[PDB]
């Protein structure tokens, strides 16, 4: 989660 949620540093 937060960093690298699947795509890249996004969310949180």
Method: NMR
Instruction: Kindly state the DSSP code that residue 4 receives in the 8-state scheme.
Output: -
- Hunting for tokens 């795509």 — which residue is that? 7
State how far the Cα of 10 lies from the Cα of 1, in Å rounded to an integer.
9
- Tell how far CA 2 is from the center of its chain: 4
Angle at CA of residue 10, ends 1 and 7, nearest 5° = 80
């Amino acid at each position: 989660y937060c960093k690298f949620e699947x795509a890249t540093f996004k969310s949180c």
